Design an enzyme around this catalytic site. Sequence first.
Site, mmCIF file in Angstrom:
data_model
loop_
_atom_site.group_PDB
_atom_site.id
_atom_site.type_symbol
_atom_site.label_atom_id
_atom_site.label_comp_id
_atom_site.label_asym_id
_atom_site.label_seq_id
_atom_site.Cartn_x
_atom_site.Cartn_y
_atom_site.Cartn_z
ATOM 1 N N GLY A 1 0.416 -1.527 0.204
ATOM 2 C CA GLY A 1 0.032 0.024 0.076
ATOM 3 C C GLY A 1 0.674 0.963 0.192
ATOM 4 O O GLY A 1 1.763 0.950 0.402
ATOM 5 N N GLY B 1 -0.708 -4.313 0.160
ATOM 6 C CA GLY B 1 -1.108 -4.413 -0.021
ATOM 7 C C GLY B 1 -2.046 -5.280 -1.441
ATOM 8 O O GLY B 1 -2.558 -5.663 -1.826
ATOM 9 N N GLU C 1 5.656 -4.733 7.206
ATOM 10 C CA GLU C 1 4.707 -4.607 7.920
ATOM 11 C C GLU C 1 5.881 -4.356 9.385
ATOM 12 O O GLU C 1 5.865 -3.196 9.972
ATOM 13 C CB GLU C 1 4.205 -4.499 8.104
ATOM 14 C CG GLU C 1 3.287 -3.877 6.760
ATOM 15 C CD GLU C 1 2.469 -4.961 6.157
ATOM 16 O OE1 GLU C 1 3.529 -6.380 5.873
ATOM 17 O OE2 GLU C 1 1.711 -4.798 5.344
ATOM 18 N N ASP D 1 -1.789 -6.502 7.525
ATOM 19 C CA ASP D 1 -3.114 -5.039 7.109
ATOM 20 C C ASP D 1 -4.415 -5.734 6.523
ATOM 21 O O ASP D 1 -4.987 -5.443 6.618
ATOM 22 C CB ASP D 1 -2.230 -3.436 7.367
ATOM 23 C CG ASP D 1 -1.116 -3.720 6.207
ATOM 24 O OD1 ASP D 1 -0.928 -5.190 5.612
ATOM 25 O OD2 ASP D 1 -0.833 -3.050 5.469
#
Lengths: 305, 53, 215, 154
Positions: free
Chosen positions: C65, C114, C137, C145
């Site tokens: 992302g 993402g 992450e 996430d």
Amino acid sequence: FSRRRIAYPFYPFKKLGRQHPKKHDTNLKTAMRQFLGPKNYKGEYVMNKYFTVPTNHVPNYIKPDLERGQSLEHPVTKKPLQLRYDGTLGPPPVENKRLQNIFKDRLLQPFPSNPHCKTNYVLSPQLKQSIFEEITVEGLSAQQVSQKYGLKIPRVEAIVKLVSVENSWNRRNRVSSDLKTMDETLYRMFPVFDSDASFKRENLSEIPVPQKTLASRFLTIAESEPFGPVDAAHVLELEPAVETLRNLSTNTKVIYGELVEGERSQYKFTNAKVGKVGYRYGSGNRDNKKDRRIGFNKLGQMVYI
Amino acid sequence: LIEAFRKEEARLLHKHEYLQKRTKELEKAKELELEKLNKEKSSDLTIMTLDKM
Amino acid sequence: APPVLFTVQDTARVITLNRPKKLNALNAEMSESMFKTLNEYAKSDTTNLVILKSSNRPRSFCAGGDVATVAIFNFNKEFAKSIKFFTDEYSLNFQIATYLKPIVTFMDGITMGGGVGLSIHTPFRIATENTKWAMPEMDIGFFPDVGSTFALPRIVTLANSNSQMALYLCLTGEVVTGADAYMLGLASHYVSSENLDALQKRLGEISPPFNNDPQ
Amino acid sequence: SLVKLANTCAHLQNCSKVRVALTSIPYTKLQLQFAYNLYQQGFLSSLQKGSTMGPDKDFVEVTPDNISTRRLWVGLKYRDNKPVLSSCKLISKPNSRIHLPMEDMKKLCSGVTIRNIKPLQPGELILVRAHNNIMDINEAISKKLDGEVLCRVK
RNA sequence: UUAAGAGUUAAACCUAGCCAACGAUCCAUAAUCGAUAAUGAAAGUUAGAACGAUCACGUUGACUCUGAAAUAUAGUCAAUA
Ligand SMILES: [Mg+2]
Ligand SMILES: [Mg+2]
Ligand SMILES: [Mg+2]
Ligand SMILES: [Mg+2]
Ligand SMILES: [Mg+2]
Ligand SMILES: [Mg+2]
Ligand SMILES: [Mg+2]
Ligand SMILES: [Mg+2]
Ligand SMILES: [Mg+2]
Ligand SMILES: [Mg+2]
Ligand SMILES: [Mg+2]
């Protein structure tokens, strides 16, 4: 290919053999005699199934295909009969299995060749009185009576009017004995309308099909667009089909003229507009033409429009 | 004759007023319809587009 | 050009991530467009399956992302925009996971953050020799996430009886490449890059045999 | 130019008969609008700008230096052993240009033969030119726009 | 001259034009048309008796009076009977 085809029965019957020179007979006549059975001294055919009317609200329509054209029965015991080799009428050698399990839809089918013709249901006098009372006394709208009893609204209004006429006739002792016997024998011939049944109650969501819709029209649109009856109604420039049901469930200046003693008629002048009122000049004459307009007077006299 | 002449006058002027109102009502109904065919419809996401080209 | 391109292959709908310079980093604009268009395709009776791919075909499918903007939306205290970003992204992930038509994801290239969310929630996810799969992450002070904590404890094949290989992948952020991702169950199929064109044609051709129910 | 549009229609039919997946048409505003309408209506799989040699991989800017060597590359669709774009014909010919008002366009879309034009068919697209914009006939009806009835494609 | 334009009719002067193979000029044939009739799916085609609209004529030709309007089914002259 086509030739003249004498309408012989489609089912077996005994044809003429050697005939006395003076008999002068036809096979069609013998077929009719066998269909009818013997004629009484009273001019009656007691042996024919269809000679007498039913009495149990089950119409006795013809079934020449199920029963192989054997229309004879014992009038009292109602058991099938057949014509033996010796000219007597006796029990069939074998029993028919097509005449016991008859589809309930076939029992209301007057004509064996037309599956789409079915007899209507007679309304009992009790139901008719109920509807008359509901409409006239309790003032219930014809829409909710139609929904309650599953009857189309014009039929409900017709019932109201007919019951009113019946009430007048009964108040005047005009319904004679013969009329009552005729009415009750006719009433016991037809099936009785049943309000509760789902398949015997009239469909209440019918609208006329107008010419505008009948033509098939197709629209190519994005694969995910919703397209409902309202959008379809907009495309065809018509009211949506639900307002048609909704609307089917449900000033000019005039001058009356001065009448005086001795004058046999009055003048009423209805206001009109120049360019719309009058008999036109050089209009089409159809009096010598095949579509000449015939109408009827308020006294029922045939007149030429 | 006065009644006819003056009613004709009135009818002509009334017709002009009505026609102006009709024009300015159509000029609004048409614009409402054109704009209502401009509200982005979600289904338009399925129509292929090449806006850059 | 638009960040997501939508095209048609005779019955399939192709969604191409179209941000080459930023390695197809996912946004709220991208997520919203994808979410709405998938909602449309869910109703279409002429759509049979969705293909997810990238224009920057060899290098990246989706390199995470675009959380740099999320970090600037919080240096300027605009927390509502970060909330909208994550709402869009995670609603899109939920849509992809529960989609009733086949979704096929081409993980040809880097697949992170993402990208894993776009690819891990579909039964049909294709790795290639170029697939570089990771979940990095932990080092940016962020968490797994995109539903990874739901998927990895379930899909990973080896040493995952109590989610411990899933934990290893999540915590270490190890880059899993090519056929290793296929063997670990992170990818469901393994197809060479040169074939993904032909596969795309084939996926555009097949239809349900009769009664036309692609679900 | 209706002559060039007719050439394009015939060329599309020719390419569908042999089942080539990709072909080229002349690079003009009318040609581009026509191809875009076909592409949005689902008759074409892709529409690209390019040269006489092939579609452009990256953007190439069109100038008088290269205008004569520009083409528009269109991808044709086939499904279930049948071409998606089978027939493509002009209605308004160069020697008989047919301009209809919105009412006659509605009649044509409703099954009426207007000026010898057969009415719109269930899966057919009729394109109309209005103010140098090509557009679907039903769209022109929605916008209440008279125009020149240009071509059928089925 | 006419209420009134115009080689419309009469007179004078000029210029050399005007129409024509998308059919002039000439010849023949025909009263014309409709929200009328026929026919056909329709475009159209046919009729123009009936209903209506317009024109022309009242045995044939020209002229004149009156009249707002007439070469009038009038008048004058001639022809035919
Ligand atoms: Mg014969
Ligand atoms: Mg003069
Ligand atoms: Mg002179
Ligand atoms: Mg000539
Ligand atoms: Mg004549
Ligand atoms: Mg004629
Ligand atoms: Mg006449
Ligand atoms: Mg006559
Ligand atoms: Mg005269
Ligand atoms: Mg005479
Ligand atoms: Mg004369």
